[PDB]
Structure 1
């Protein structure tokens, strides 16, 4: 028997399709996991192959919570620490944000989704320490989910990284994974710092996870990620009435075998709830929206919202706070 939950699978299907239509997008995917077991409660694609497991993307901004996770886990950075977030140079290259903040603390980097900040956090570690970390989240590794065509994604060896590549990788370019690997990766945040295996089958035994960061770190990062959906953050479109939601937006220019083209984007929105004691991850990706803008927030936010809200209703999770 499958872990799939028909009500949720139906909900995801309806909501994905409304969005991919509304935004005149080329393709789309939604994945819902059990946050505490890695079971796939829903997995849905626009008609065609199972993109959620066969296709690989650059995570972009959705990678940022891990870089922060790693920094805090190390003991070398505390959430309250301030960083100069102005544009800067890695030799011949320039790291910069869309909107420029002189300084941010770690919560601001998460909230405002700053490349500069994220790359400074990364810059505090070796090529090897960051590759080992990405590797332990499952980037470049086979999940063994049993789906046909399962990509392992792409993690180039640290042994051949320029300094610019360490940076661009810390904020999600240069490495690749499936939306399902990405959702799986978030089990580190939701399952108290342990990476769960994913499954399309009901587990008789509750599955064990491999430890990657401490529980207290996961706990703190979840707290920080709530900033994304509160006023001031990139991801307010994904707030759900009656709950705190940890989420991360991602808006990426499209890598088309080699070159970045800048009038083409991929919108991804991923998060969990209840933020303090999470039950589900929802990951949404929409490929190349043409109509009504391209920001994660506008495109994938509403679908995240509906699916998360509907998912916690269906599983019978009680609101943690009164409905507005």
Structure 2
């Protein structure tokens, strides 16, 4: 009855989701089925049958024999344990030659990679009455009308399964090491905006349904973060274009007094009068507050808006969050300079960061390559590189890139743990407090931080941008503070560059 639901593909044609035939176990227990037959067509020994069935379906013989003993029933099924059985399960059941036992073909949605870009691909759910499948999250839901049928259309993603494996492995390592409450990593083509890989933790397995529903939100498009100091790059860009930033000019570091709050550099005492470039390498908060004064508060708010913040990127993901620029008072304004109070989505961060490597042009990130029917060959949609806006000049973009280089590679860098032997890396570190969901403060604890890194490589002319973020390590929180996401950035970026044939040296 149901039309075949279309497939979801990665950018090289690997199947990410497709319909398959599986099998459901049925046991006829009524004698009436065997009235006309010499060999029985119903279960004659319920105990032996239960014992043999327990060697295939995940159910104890005692529960099977209980289900076989239901009164006033012609045939029985075994709930979830008796459905979605494989062809090999079917073979071993059938070789037992158990009277009354058969297997019914049923259509199931199959995700060949299991837990793999799960919050992007989503999950399609089955209506048992009809077999009708309906997407409940991500691409399966966004494109449900196209995917469902004739035959539904296929959706091709920009995701590269080879790069996605690197991301899934690195994120597993972060879970083991740090048990964070939230975790994401994303890899984008620095020159086109294509999402090459995306994952988050915790997540679900779309194949089995394990943990589906425990977190509805996709981190890339629907979750918001106070970004911390990765956000300083946009304040730097603005201050550069306005002439307030001079890399060699000195400024007074240490602290600033804003509406009765002491906002200090991370070492409390500062470094005296130091060049602005060094302050950016040190990730000086007083530098950013100084530059905001020089530019002017009204102008800086417009600057963050021109970089796309506070607005949806208008991607094809459902319910994209807008974030919010925290600007309601001077304290909010000043803390926004280093990525506190303001909330962003990771996709806004990627869009904004792409400006520095595309002559000032922001690229709209995208992950849908095409929607098209393989039978009719109709192309309903084709993704493309699109400029989201040009907030800065090419000259400003280069001067920002020079400072991002210094953050990682300066002889005074405090981010050398993001270096990769053989490759040149650049980017910006972040450590931020995390808003408590309930009650009006920050999560309390020894190191209750969202730590992140917006990185790109090769430096100056990158092939990819890799952004990774970790919220609230429940294990090794002190090291999470010290090393940030470097134990995820380094395996993802190194393997990705090798796979993209970037020569090491």
- Structure 1 length normalisation: TM-score? 0.92
Deviations 1:218-275 (A, max 9, x none): 1121121122223432321211222221111111121114302342211111111111
Matching residue of 2:336: 169
State the structure with bigger RCO (CA 8 A, min sep 6), 1 or 2.
1
2:275 is the counterpart of 1:105: yes
Distance 1:244 1:104, change over 3 A: farther
Deviations 1:63-93 (A, max 9, x none): 1111111111112332211110122212422
Matching residue of 2:368: 201
Distance 2:264 2:469 in 1: 24
Distance 1:288 1:104, change over 3 A: same
Deviations 1:85-122 (A, max 9, x none): 12221242212012121133222122111111111011
Distance 2:340 2:431 in 1: 12
2:225 is the counterpart of 1:57: yes
Could you list the runs of 5+ residues in structure 1 that have no partner in the other structure?
Answer: none
How far residue 56 of structure 1 moved from its aligned partner, in angstroms, is 0.3
Distance 1:135 1:185, change over 3 A: same
Secondary structure, aligned partner of 2:279: helix
2:241 is the counterpart of 1:73: yes
How far residue 205 of structure 1 moved from its aligned partner, in angstroms, is 4.8
Q: Which runs of 4+ in 1 moved over 3 A?
A: 202-206, 294-297
How far residue 31 of structure 1 moved from its aligned partner, in angstroms, is 0.8
Secondary structure, aligned partner of 1:259: coil
Q: Is the 8 A contact 1:251 1:268 kept in 2?
A: yes
| Residue number among 30, 42, 45 corresponding to 2:185 in the alignment | 30
Distance 1:6 1:297 in 2: 31
Q: Is the 8 A contact 1:122 1:170 kept in 2?
A: yes
Structure with higher helix content:
1
Could you list the runs of 5+ residues in structure 2 that have no partner in the other structure?
Answer: 1-155, 204-214, 370-381
Q: Is the 8 A contact 1:111 1:234 kept in 2?
A: yes
| Residue number among 317, 330, 340 corresponding to 1:147 in the alignment | 317
Instruction: Name the stretch that deviates more: 201-210 or 177-186.
Output: 201-210
Structure-to-structure mapping, 1:257-296, within 5 angstroms: 257=437, 258-263=440-445, 264-292=448-476, 293-295=478-480
How far residue 57 of structure 1 moved from its aligned partner, in angstroms, is 0.5
- Structure 2 length normalisation: TM-score? 0.60
Instruction: Name the stretch that deviates more: 7-16 or 218-227.
Output: 218-227
Q: Is the 8 A contact 2:167 2:492 kept in 1?
A: yes
Secondary structure, aligned partner of 1:275: coil
Instruction: Name the stretch that deviates more: 187-196 or 54-63.
Output: 187-196
Distance 2:503 2:343 in 1: 36
Distance 1:295 1:108, change over 3 A: farther
Q: Is the 8 A contact 1:226 1:247 kept in 2?
A: yes
Structure-to-structure mapping, 1:1-324, within 5 angstroms: 1-46=156-201, 47=203, 48=215, 49-99=217-267, 100-156=270-326, 158=327, 161-202=328-369, 205-230=384-409, 231-257=411-437, 258-263=440-445, 264-292=448-476, 293-295=478-480, 297-319=482-504, 322=505
Aligned CA RMSD, in angstroms, stands at: 1.8
